[PDB]
Design an enzyme around this catalytic site. Structure first.
Site, PDB file in Angstrom:
ATOM      1  N   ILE A  68      45.041 -76.518  24.258  1.00 18.27           N
ATOM      2  CA  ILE A  68      44.737 -77.889  24.253  1.00 18.27           C
ATOM      3  C   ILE A  68      44.310 -78.576  23.097  1.00 18.27           C
ATOM      4  CG2 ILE A  68      44.664 -78.030  26.898  1.00 18.27           C
ATOM      5  CD1 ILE A  68      41.673 -78.182  26.639  1.00 18.27           C
ATOM      6  N   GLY A  69      43.678 -77.842  22.164  1.00 20.68           N
ATOM      7  CA  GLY A  69      43.159 -78.167  20.908  1.00 20.68           C
ATOM      8  C   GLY A  69      42.890 -77.096  20.043  1.00 20.68           C
ATOM      9  N   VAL A  89      41.247 -74.034  21.387  1.00 20.04           N
ATOM     10  CA  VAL A  89      40.876 -74.438  22.609  1.00 20.04           C
ATOM     11  C   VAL A  89      41.580 -74.797  23.853  1.00 20.04           C
ATOM     12  CG1 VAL A  89      39.676 -76.577  23.722  1.00 20.04           C
ATOM     13  CG2 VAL A  89      39.194 -76.050  21.049  1.00 20.04           C
ATOM     14  N   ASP A 125      29.642 -88.727  15.555  1.00 25.36           N
ATOM     15  CA  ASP A 125      31.298 -88.988  15.737  1.00 25.36           C
ATOM     16  C   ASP A 125      31.541 -89.595  16.984  1.00 25.36           C
ATOM     17  OD1 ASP A 125      31.191 -85.923  14.259  1.00 25.36           O
ATOM     18  OD2 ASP A 125      32.435 -87.190  13.129  1.00 25.36           O
ATOM     19  N   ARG A 157      37.635 -91.287  21.812  1.00 29.77           N
ATOM     20  CA  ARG A 157      38.386 -89.803  21.551  1.00 29.77           C
ATOM     21  C   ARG A 157      37.377 -88.755  21.949  1.00 29.77           C
ATOM     22  NH1 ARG A 157      38.358 -91.745  16.828  1.00 29.77           N
ATOM     23  NH2 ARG A 157      36.918 -91.107  15.072  1.00 29.77           N
ATOM     24  N   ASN A 158      36.065 -89.004  21.740  1.00 30.46           N
ATOM     25  CA  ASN A 158      35.013 -87.873  21.984  1.00 30.46           C
ATOM     26  C   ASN A 158      34.393 -88.086  23.375  1.00 30.46           C
ATOM     27  OD1 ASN A 158      35.583 -86.116  20.003  1.00 30.46           O
ATOM     28  ND2 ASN A 158      34.169 -87.258  18.559  1.00 30.46           N
ATOM     29  N   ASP A 187      31.688 -83.387  21.595  1.00 31.42           N
ATOM     30  CA  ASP A 187      31.637 -83.245  20.486  1.00 31.42           C
ATOM     31  C   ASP A 187      32.172 -82.265  19.725  1.00 31.42           C
ATOM     32  OD1 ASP A 187      30.814 -84.269  17.693  1.00 31.42           O
ATOM     33  OD2 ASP A 187      28.526 -84.215  18.120  1.00 31.42           O
TER      34      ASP A 187
HETATM   35  C1  LIG Z   1      35.132 -76.076  25.016  1.00 27.74           C
HETATM   36  C2  LIG Z   1      34.348 -77.142  24.412  1.00 27.74           C
HETATM   37  C3  LIG Z   1      33.179 -76.685  23.660  1.00 27.74           C
HETATM   38  C4  LIG Z   1      32.252 -77.509  23.093  1.00 27.74           C
HETATM   39  C5  LIG Z   1      32.381 -79.058  23.546  1.00 27.74           C
HETATM   40  C6  LIG Z   1      31.454 -79.958  23.006  1.00 27.74           C
HETATM   41  O1  LIG Z   1      31.671 -81.058  23.655  1.00 27.74           O
HETATM   42  N1  LIG Z   1      30.380 -79.677  22.434  1.00 27.74           N
HETATM   43  C7  LIG Z   1      29.327 -80.368  21.901  1.00 27.74           C
HETATM   44  C8  LIG Z   1      28.759 -79.890  20.902  1.00 27.74           C
HETATM   45  C9  LIG Z   1      27.731 -80.765  20.175  1.00 27.74           C
HETATM   46  C10 LIG Z   1      27.054 -81.760  20.963  1.00 27.74           C
HETATM   47  C11 LIG Z   1      27.912 -82.365  22.180  1.00 27.74           C
HETATM   48  C12 LIG Z   1      27.436 -83.393  22.941  1.00 27.74           C
HETATM   49  F1  LIG Z   1      28.031 -84.232  22.623  1.00 27.74           F
HETATM   50  F2  LIG Z   1      27.376 -83.131  23.873  1.00 27.74           F
HETATM   51  F3  LIG Z   1      26.362 -83.603  22.341  1.00 27.74           F
HETATM   52  C13 LIG Z   1      28.934 -81.717  22.659  1.00 27.74           C
HETATM   53  C14 LIG Z   1      33.551 -79.244  24.575  1.00 27.74           C
HETATM   54  C15 LIG Z   1      34.145 -78.407  24.793  1.00 27.74           C
HETATM   55  N2  LIG Z   1      35.259 -79.021  26.013  1.00 27.74           N
HETATM   56  C16 LIG Z   1      36.062 -79.639  25.787  1.00 27.74           C
HETATM   57  N3  LIG Z   1      36.097 -80.420  24.593  1.00 27.74           N
HETATM   58  C17 LIG Z   1      36.967 -81.471  24.516  1.00 27.74           C
HETATM   59  N4  LIG Z   1      36.791 -82.114  23.206  1.00 27.74           N
HETATM   60  C18 LIG Z   1      37.923 -83.078  22.919  1.00 27.74           C
HETATM   61  C19 LIG Z   1      37.334 -84.372  22.019  1.00 27.74           C
HETATM   62  N5  LIG Z   1      36.597 -83.813  21.166  1.00 27.74           N
HETATM   63  C20 LIG Z   1      35.391 -82.895  21.455  1.00 27.74           C
HETATM   64  C21 LIG Z   1      35.979 -81.673  22.331  1.00 27.74           C
HETATM   65  N6  LIG Z   1      37.664 -81.873  25.307  1.00 27.74           N
HETATM   66  C22 LIG Z   1      37.591 -81.094  26.498  1.00 27.74           C
HETATM   67  N7  LIG Z   1      38.451 -81.336  27.639  1.00 27.74           N
HETATM   68  C23 LIG Z   1      39.698 -82.145  27.616  1.00 27.74           C
HETATM   69  C24 LIG Z   1      40.088 -82.152  28.692  1.00 27.74           C
HETATM   70  N8  LIG Z   1      39.551 -81.641  29.504  1.00 27.74           N
HETATM   71  C25 LIG Z   1      38.377 -81.028  28.822  1.00 27.74           C
HETATM   72  N9  LIG Z   1      36.941 -80.048  26.775  1.00 27.74           N
END
Ligand SMILES: Cc1ccc(C(=O)Nc2cccc(C(F)(F)F)c2)cc1Nc1nc(N2CCNCC2)nc(-n2ccnc2)n1
Length: 267
Positions: A15-16, A23, A130, A134-135, A148
């Site tokens: 998915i990414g 990911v 960021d 989108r986030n 993030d």
């Molecule tokens: C596996 C995974 C690992 C890490 C993070 C994450 O957030 N680390 C982070 C690090 C520092 C601060 C913050 C804080 F923000 F929280 F502060 C958050 C999110 C995901 N998991 C995940 N990540 C995304 N994306 C897409 C957009 N860009 C970001 C990542 N999308 C989905 N996803 C899509 C559909 N269902 C779920 N899952």
């Protein structure tokens, strides 16, 4: 953070992309759907520090509007960060695919959730850098959760000009997110180039009101875009205002004037 054994994780769909790995969407047993970021063979020392450091920070967060960490795989290779899965995906795409489908109160409720997550992050001394639709991830209850990675149009002037990233530059980005939500995912500044955006902002121009936007919501996003960082509301102010508007919903019925670009004459 909780350590998960690899036998409990099934990777299903890519998915990414991660910083050094993929990911995936998958399943976690203890089945619940999850997202999985991997760190693949050959990663550097710096990449491992950042990957495990990311896991550690996420493990510290416990908030309704922050993506939930299910656990980590650090004792086996590839290493993995495992989070909850949000079936509606990213907010920008979600809104663009559901144009006009929500009430003003639903949209403002989304913003209150994002603001509460950001208030928590800022209080925990985490500067996002960021923040953009989108986030943000959306679940099946319409709850928005900040996420993030390990963006000129979203970034405050001082962060662009001299790399001053703070919770107050995150407030600028939050104002842009408010505009993204109220427009159902329109691209900020439309087709203006990055240089044209920065020139417009420096000249004092700001994004115009979205269609059908509560006056109070446009006023709030405008105050997020103050040039002087100290004049921008803090996230506590944003949460408080949005909460009060939601709890007195007639306050949202007064709409800001929309500047029409096209005028049609009919009798
Ligand atoms: C596996 C995974 C690992 C890490 C993070 C994450 O957030 N680390 C982070 C690090 C520092 C601060 C913050 C804080 F923000 F929280 F502060 C958050 C999110 C995901 N998991 C995940 N990540 C995304 N994306 C897409 C957009 N860009 C970001 C990542 N999308 C989905 N996803 C899509 C559909 N269902 C779920 N899952």
């Amino acid at each position: 953070t909780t350590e998960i054994h690899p036998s409990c994780v099934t990777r299903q769909k890519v998915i990414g992309a991660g910083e050094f790995g993929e990911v995936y969407k998958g399943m976690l047993k203890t089945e619940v759907p999850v997202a999985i970021k991997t760190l693949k063979a050959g990663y550097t020392e710096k990449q491992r520090v950042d990957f495990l450091g990311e896991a550690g920070i996420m493990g510290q967060f416990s908030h309704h509007n922050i993506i939930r960490l299910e656990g980590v795989i650090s004792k086996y290779k590839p290493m993995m960060i495992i989070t909850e899965y949000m079936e509606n995906g990213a907010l920008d795409k979600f809104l663009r695919e559901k144009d006009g489908e929500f009430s003003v109160l639903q949209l403002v409720g989304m913003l209150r959730g994002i603001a509460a997550g950001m208030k928590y992050l800022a209080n925990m001394n985490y500067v996002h850098r960021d923040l953009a639709a989108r986030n943000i991830l959306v679940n099946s209850n319409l709850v928005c959760k900040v996420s993030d990675f390990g963006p000129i149009r979203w970034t405050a002037p001082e962060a662009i000009s001299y790399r001053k990233f703070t919770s107050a530059s995150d407030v600028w980005s939050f104002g842009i997110v408010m505009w993204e939500v109220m427009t159902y995912g329109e691209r900020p500044y439309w087709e203006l180039s990055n240089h044209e955006v920065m020139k417009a902002i420096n000249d004092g121009f700001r994004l115009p009101t979205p269609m059908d936007c509560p006056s109070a919501i446009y006023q709030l996003m405008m105050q997020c875009w103050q040039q002087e960082r100290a004049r921008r509301p803090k996230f506590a102010d944003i949460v408080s205002i949005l909460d009060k508007l939601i709890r007195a919903p007639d306050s949202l019925k007064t709409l800001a004037d929309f500047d029409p670009r096209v005028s049609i004459r009919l009798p």
